[PDB]
Structure 1
Amino acid sequence: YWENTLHTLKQRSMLSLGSSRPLVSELDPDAPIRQKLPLDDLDREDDIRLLKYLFTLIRAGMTDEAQRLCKRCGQAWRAATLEGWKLYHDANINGGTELQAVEGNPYRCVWKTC
């Protein structure tokens, strides 16, 4: 992913030309959405298609295939973000029992407020 963006950045860095437009700073999925300046309509369309696939996979109630596609492509940020509205499973009473109270957070109130 980000092949065209990387090529444009390389051209701008090696020849001072090839980025006569609102360019980006970093190659992160949150950098343009934070700087409020987009880039490449083809990349936006590909991201829209990937989000369509993620929505079709999540609506069915699946997560394994979702993270599989995330690891295959490279957009696991959505799967990493969609894991904050959970809650700890307080059931551990000793050390021999497996640690299952690690998923979730007590800040679900501020999460749903945001």
Structure 2
Amino acid sequence: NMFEIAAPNASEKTIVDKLFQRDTLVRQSQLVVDWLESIAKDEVGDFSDNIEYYAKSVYWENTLHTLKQRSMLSLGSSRPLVSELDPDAPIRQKLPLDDLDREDDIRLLKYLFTLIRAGMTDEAQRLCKRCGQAWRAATLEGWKLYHDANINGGTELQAVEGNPYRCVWKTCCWRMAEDEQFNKYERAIYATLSGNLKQLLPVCESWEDTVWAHFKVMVDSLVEQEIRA
């Protein structure tokens, strides 16, 4: 009883679960991915309780205190800094940021980068709401699709998840990748969310990582093919 056919008549999650059920090749691809990432999460374990001791919750504290003293003292500083807290404040402004700031950043980038190379998403929002990158946690949501089934009962939550602008939004990320100029972490995560082979080359070098990426890319390309189909 393999493979099916239909036309759009209801919420796109119908499309989704049809697509999941119909094909074999993607099915074993999904299972081997579950294998590898089960490996990953077994490696993870209690990184939750272990980050209890990695924590800092002051945004760009060094730039904070130094601009404070520039405004605060007889003498300021001869050092350029952002006037903005924006996640793109420096590079948009080309303005520098402090090393301790950026490097505790890189540290949390290891944390969550690993967490999401494993996909450890609960811990992902955990770390977001630790360090106050709720903006970044928002950025995390651009790909997860949309649904609702409240065609029943009272006005009750069946799904409210996200913005249905996601196909074009991945296209936008695709072109951002073609634009480059990224940190390793953002480069990897969104070249991943795009399955972009060349910009996924830098970070995956292991046997497991390269086969993993093979499966990721091919599963994506397939899945979007029968999305449009």
TM-score (norm 1): 0.81
Contact 2:62–2:100 at 8 Å: present in 1 too?
no
Distance 1:35 1:56, change over 3 A: same
Q: 1:110 aligns with which of 146, 150, 168?
A: 168
Q: 1:42 to 1:31 in 2, by over 3 A?
A: same
- List, as ranges, runs of 4+ consecutive aligned residues in structure 1 with deviation greater than 4 Å: none
Could you say what secondary structure the match of 1:106 adopts? coil
Structure 1 residue 101, shift from structure 2 partner: 2.8
Among candidates 128, 140, 145, match of residue 82 of structure 1: 140
Residue 51 of structure 1, CA deviation: 1.2
1:26-82 deviation digits (Å, cap 9, x = unpaired): 234332232121211221111111111111111222221111122222223221111
Aligned length: 113
Q: State how 1:88-99 maps to structure 2 within 5 Å.
A: 88-96=146-154, 98-99=156-157
Tell me the percent identity: 99
**CA–CA distance in 1 between the matches of 2:101 and 2:88?**
14
> Helix, strand or coil: the match of 2:141?
coil
1:1-114 equivalences under 5 Å are: 1-15=59-73, 17-96=75-154, 98-112=156-170
Cα offset for 1:16?
5.7
What secondary structure does 1:80 align onto? helix
Question: 2:87 is paired with a residue of what secondary structure?
Answer: coil
Contact 2:147 2:160 in 1 (8 A): yes
TM-score, structure 2 normalization = 0.44
Separation of aligned partners in 2, 1:34 and 1:66: 26
User: Is residue 148–residue 160 contact of structure 2 (8 Å, CA) maintained in 1?
Assistant: no
For 1:93 and 1:82, locate their aligned partners in 2 and report how far apart those are by CA, in whole Å: 28
- How far apart are residue 104 of structure 1 and its match? 2.6
Instruction: Give the number of the structure whose residues are more often helix, by fraction.
Output: 2
Separation of aligned partners in 2, 1:26 and 1:19: 17
Distance 1:74 1:105, change over 3 A: closer
Gaps of 5+ in 1: none
1:31/1:100 CA distance change after superposition, 3 Å: farther
The structure with higher relative contact order (CA 8 Å, sep 6+) is 2
35-44 or 96-105, which deviates more: 96-105
**Displacement of 1:88 after TM fit?**
1.5
